[PDB]
Amino acid sequence: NLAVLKLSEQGVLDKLKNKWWYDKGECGAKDSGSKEKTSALSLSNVAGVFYILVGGLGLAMLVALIEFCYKSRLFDRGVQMLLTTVGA
Amino acid sequence: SIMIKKPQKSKPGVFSFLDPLAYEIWMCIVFAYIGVSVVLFLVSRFSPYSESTNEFGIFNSLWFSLGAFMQQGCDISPRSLSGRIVGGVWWFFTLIIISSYTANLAAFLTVERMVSPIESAEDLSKQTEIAYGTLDSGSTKEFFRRSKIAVFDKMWTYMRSAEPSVFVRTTAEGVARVRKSKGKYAYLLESTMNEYIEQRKPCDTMKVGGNLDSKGYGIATPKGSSLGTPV
Amino acid sequence: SIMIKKPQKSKPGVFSFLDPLAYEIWMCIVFAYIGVSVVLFLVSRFSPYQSSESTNEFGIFNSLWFSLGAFMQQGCDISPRSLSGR
Amino acid sequence: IVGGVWWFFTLIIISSYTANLAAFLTVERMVSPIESAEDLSKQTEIAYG
Amino acid sequence: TLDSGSTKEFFRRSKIAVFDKMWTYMRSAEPSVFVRTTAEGVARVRKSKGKYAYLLESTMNEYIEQRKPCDTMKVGGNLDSKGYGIATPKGSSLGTPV
Amino acid sequence: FAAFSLMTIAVGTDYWLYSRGVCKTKVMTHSGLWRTCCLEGNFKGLCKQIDHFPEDADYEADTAEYFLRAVRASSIFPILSVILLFMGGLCIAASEFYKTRHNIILSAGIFFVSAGLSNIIGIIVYISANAG
Numbered sequence: 191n192l193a194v195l196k197l198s199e200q201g202v203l204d205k206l207k208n209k210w211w212y213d214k215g216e217c218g219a220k221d222s223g224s225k226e227k228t229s230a231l232s233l234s235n236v237a238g239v240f241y242i243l244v245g246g247l248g249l250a251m252l253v254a255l256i257e258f259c260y261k262s263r264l265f266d267r268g269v270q271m272l273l274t275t276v277g278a
Numbered sequence: 279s280i281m282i283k284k285p286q287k288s289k290p291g292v293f294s295f296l297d298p299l300a301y302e303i304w305m306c307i308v309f310a311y312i313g314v315s316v317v318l319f320l321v322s323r324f325s326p327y328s329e330s331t332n333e334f335g336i337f338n339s340l341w342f343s344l345g346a347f348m349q350q351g352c353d354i355s356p357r358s359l360s361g362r363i364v365g366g367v368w369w370f371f372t373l374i375i376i377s378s379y380t381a382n383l384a385a386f387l388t389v390e391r392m393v394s395p396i397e398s399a400e401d402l403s404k405q406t407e408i409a410y411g412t413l414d415s416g417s418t419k420e421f422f423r424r425s426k427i428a429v430f431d432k433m434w435t436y437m438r439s440a441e442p443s444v445f446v447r448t449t450a451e452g453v454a455r456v457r458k459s460k461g462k463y464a465y466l467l468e469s470t471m472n473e474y475i476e477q478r479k480p481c482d483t484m485k486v487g488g489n490l491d492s493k494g495y496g497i498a499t500p501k502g503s504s505l506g507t508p509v
Numbered sequence: 510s511i512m513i514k515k516p517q518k519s520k521p522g523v524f525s526f527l528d529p530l531a532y533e534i535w536m537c538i539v540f541a542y543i544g545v546s547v548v549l550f551l552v553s554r555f556s557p558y559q560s561s562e563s564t565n566e567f568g569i570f571n572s573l574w575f576s577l578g579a580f581m582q583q584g585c586d587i588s589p590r591s592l593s594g595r
Numbered sequence: 596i597v598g599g600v601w602w603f604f605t606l607i608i609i610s611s612y613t614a615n616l617a618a619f620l621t622v623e624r625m626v627s628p629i630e631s632a633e634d635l636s637k638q639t640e641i642a643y644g
Numbered sequence: 645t646l647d648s649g650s651t652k653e654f655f656r657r658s659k660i661a662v663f664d665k666m667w668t669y670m671r672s673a674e675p676s677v678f679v680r681t682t683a684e685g686v687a688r689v690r691k692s693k694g695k696y697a698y699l700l701e702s703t704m705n706e707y708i709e710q711r712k713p714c715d716t717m718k719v720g721g722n723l724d725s726k727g728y729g730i731a732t733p734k735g736s737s738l739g740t741p742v
Numbered sequence: 743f744a745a746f747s748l749m750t751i752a753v754g755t756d757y758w759l760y761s762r763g764v765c766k767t768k769v770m771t772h773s774g775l776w777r778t779c780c781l782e783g784n785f786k787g788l789c790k791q792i793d794h795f796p797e798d799a800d801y802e803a804d805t806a807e808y809f810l811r812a813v814r815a816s817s818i819f820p821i822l823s824v825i826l827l828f829m830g831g832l833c834i835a836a837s838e839f840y841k842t843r844h845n846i847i848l849s850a851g852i853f854f855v856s857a858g859l860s861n862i863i864g865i866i867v868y869i870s871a872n873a874g
C-alpha cells in the first residue's frame with residue numbers, strides 16, 4: 191500500500207507505461223499520421239464529370255431528333271389569360 | 279554523427295508541367311474534345327428548314343470547342359436550342375477541370391523536398407526496423423556502454439541485444455554495410471569521418487541530424503616522459 | 510471498450526465535385542440565376558420608344574443564355590447595349 | 596495552329612505565374628552589409644575595435 | 645497554486661527537473677504567486693489579462709469552463725493520475741464498511 | 743469495315759494491360775478482358791477467367807463500388823459498340839437498295855456516333871475499375 195503510492199508519486203508508473211505502450215509505436219497511423227504527400231490526380235477522382243458530359247450529349251441529340259420529327263409534319267392568345275390566372 | 283544511405287531524389291523531367299494530371303486523363307480529355315465537337319456539328323447541320331443560314335461546320339466547331347476550352351472566348355455562339363444545350367455542358371466540363379489544374383499546380387509549386395527520415399536518433403531508440411552499430415574497440419562503443427542518458431541506454435540495450443552482430447571491425451566495413459543495407463542498417467561515427475565520406479564519390483551517403491557531444495583529438499604520450507610539455 | 514475490425518477507406522463518390530459548397534448555397538445560386546435572368550428580361554422589351562419593340566435582341570431565352578454564359582466565364586456574343594439592364 | 600499553340604502557351608504560363616503571388620509581395624528580407632569582414636580592411640567607413 | 649494544497653506539496657517534493665524549476669520560480673516570487681482560496685485565484689486570472697496562469701485539478705477546471713462568463717480556458721493535457729477518496733481516522737471500525 | 747474489324751479484334755483479345763500478378767492460385771501478367779492470362783513463369787499461357795470477388799468489410803449496397811463492378815465484369819458498353827457499328831454498316835450497305843428516298847443514310851451515321859460514345863464510356867469504366 192505504501193510502495194504503490196511511492197511509484198505513483200515518482201512517476202515510475204508513467205515511465206513504465208511509456209516504455210510498454212508508446213515507445214513501441216510500430217504499425218502505421220501513429221508514425222505516418224503527421225506526414226504529407228502532395229498529389230497526383232487520377233481518373234477515378236474525376237469520372238462523374240465525364241458521365242455528365244456524355245449524358246448531356248445524348249440528351250441534346252435526342253432533342254434535335256424529336257425537333258426534326260415534329261417539324262416534318264403559346265397557343266390561343268386568349269387562354270394564356272386562363273393559364274396565368276390559374277397560375278396566380 | 280549518424281550516417282545513412284542518401285535516398286535517391288527524383289528530378290523533374292522536360293515535360294514536368296503536365297504533372298498534376300495522369301496520362302489516362304490526358305487521353306480522355308482529347309477523346310471527349312473530339313466527341314463534343316462532332317456532336318455539335320451533327321446537331322448543327324441537320325436540314326433545319328434556309329440551309330446556309332447557320333454558321334457552324336466541322337471546322338468552325340473544331341476550334342469553337344477549343345476556344346471554349348481554353349478561356350479565350352469565341353467568335354460566334356450556338357443559336358439552336360440543342361446547340362445551346364450541348365454547349366452549356368461543355369462549359370460546365372471545362373470549369374471543373376481547368377480549375378483543378380491550376381489549383382493543383384499551385385500545390386506542385388510549393389514543395390519538392392523529402393520528408394527527412396529517422397532524424398535525432400530518438401526514433402533509432404523507438405523503432406525496431408533500421409539497425410545500427412558502432413566500431414569495435416572504440417570510444418563511441420565504450421561511451422554507449424558507460425552512458426547514463428536513458429535514450430542512449432536503450433540504444434546500448436538494442437546494440438548488445440543484436441542478431442546478428444551490429445558491430446563491425448573497421449570503418450570501411452561499416453561503410454560498405456550501410457552502402458549495401460538499402461536503408462536498413464544505420465551507422466555511427468565521428469563528424470569529420472562523416473563529412474569526408476560525404477565529399478567523395480559516389481556521394482550516396484548522407485549526414486542526418488546534429489551532433490551529440492564535444493570530443494577532441496589530441497597527442498598521446500606515455501605518462502611522465504619528458505616529451506609532454508614541449509609537445 | 511469495444512473492439513471491431515478495421516473498416517476500409519471509403520473514397521469519395523461520383524457527385525463529389527460539388528462538395529466544397531453547401532447544398533443551400535447551390536439552391537440560392539439556382540434561385541438567383543432565375544431571378545436575375547427574369548429581371549433582365551423585364552428591363553428590356555419594355556415598349557422601347559419602325560423598330561419600337563425589336564430594338565434589343567434579348568428574348569427571355571436569350572437572357573437565360575446570357576446569364577448562364579456570364580456565370581461560367583465565357584461571355585456570349587450579345588451585350589446589354591442599354592442602361593438599367595447593365 | 597499558331598493561335599491555339601499560343602493559347603496553350605498563355606494558359607500554362609500565367610497559371611504558373613499566379614500560383615503563389617501573395618507570398619512574393621510580403622517578404623521583408625535583410626541586407627547584411629558585410630560578413631567575412633575584409634571590408635573592414637577595404638572601406639574606411641565603419642569602425643571596429 | 646493553492647496554499648495548504650497537495651499540488652503545492654507535489655511541486656515541493658517533485659524531482660522532475662522541469663517541475664523543479666517551476667517550484668524554484670514559485671518559491672522565488674515577487675509578490676506572492678500563491679493564493680488562499682480557489683475563487684481568489686479565479687478572480688486573479690480573470691483580471692490578470694494573460695499575465696498570471698493558474699494551476700488546479702481538471703474537474704475544477706471543467707466546472708469553471710461550463711459556467712458563465714466562459715472567459716476561461718483549459719490548455720494542454722494532464723500531468724498525473726490523482727484520486728479522491730473517503731478519509732477515516734486510522735483504525736476505526738468504519739473503514740471496511742465504508 | 744476497318745473500324746468494325748479493329749473493334750472486334752480489341753474485344754476478342756486477352757492482351758490489353760501488363761502488370762504483376764498470379765496465374766492460378768489454390769509474375770508478369772498477360773492480362774486482358776476476363777482471361778487474366780499470364781507468361782514468364784512455371785507455365786506460360788494458362789488463361790484464368792476472372793470476375794469480381796473481393797474480401798472486404800462487407801459493403802452491402804455500396805453503389806459506386808458495386809454497380810460499377812457489375813458494369814465492369816459484364817462488358818455491356820464495350821459490346822454495344824460492336825452492335826451499333828454493325829447496325830450502321832448494315833444501313834450504309836443498304837444505301838444502294840431501296841434508294842432515292844434521301845433519308846436512310848442519315849440514320850446510318852447516328853449509330854457510328856453513338857457507338858463511339860459507348861466506347862469512351864467503356865474505356866472510362868475499365869480504367870476506373872482497374873484502379874478500383
Ligand SMILES: N=C(N)NCCC[C@H](N)C(=O)NCCCNCCCNCCCCCNC(=O)[C@H](CC(N)=O)NC(=O)Cc1ccc(O)cc1O
Binds near residue numbers: 348350351585
Ligand atoms: N451586319 C453586318 N454586315 N455585320 C455585322 C457582324 C457583327 C459580328 N457578328 C459581331 O458583332 N461579332 C461580335 C463578337 C464579339 N464576341 C467577343 C466575345 C469574347 N469574349 C471572350 C471573353 C473570355 C474571357 C475569359 N476569361 C478567363 O479565362 C478568366 C481570366 C483569367 N484570370 O485568366 N480565367 C480565370 O480567371 C482562371 C482563374 C480564376 C481564378 C484563379 O484564382 C485562377 C485562375 O487561373
Ligand SMILES: N[C@@H](CCC(=O)O)C(=O)O
Binds near residue numbers: 415418419
Ligand atoms: N578516436 C576514437 C574513434 C573510435 C570511436 O569514436 O569509438 C578512438 O580512437 O577510440
Ligand SMILES: N[C@@H](CCC(=O)O)C(=O)O
Binds near residue numbers: 648651
Ligand atoms: N484535493 C486537494 C486539492 C488541493 C491541491 O490539489 O493542492 C487537497 O485536498 O489537497
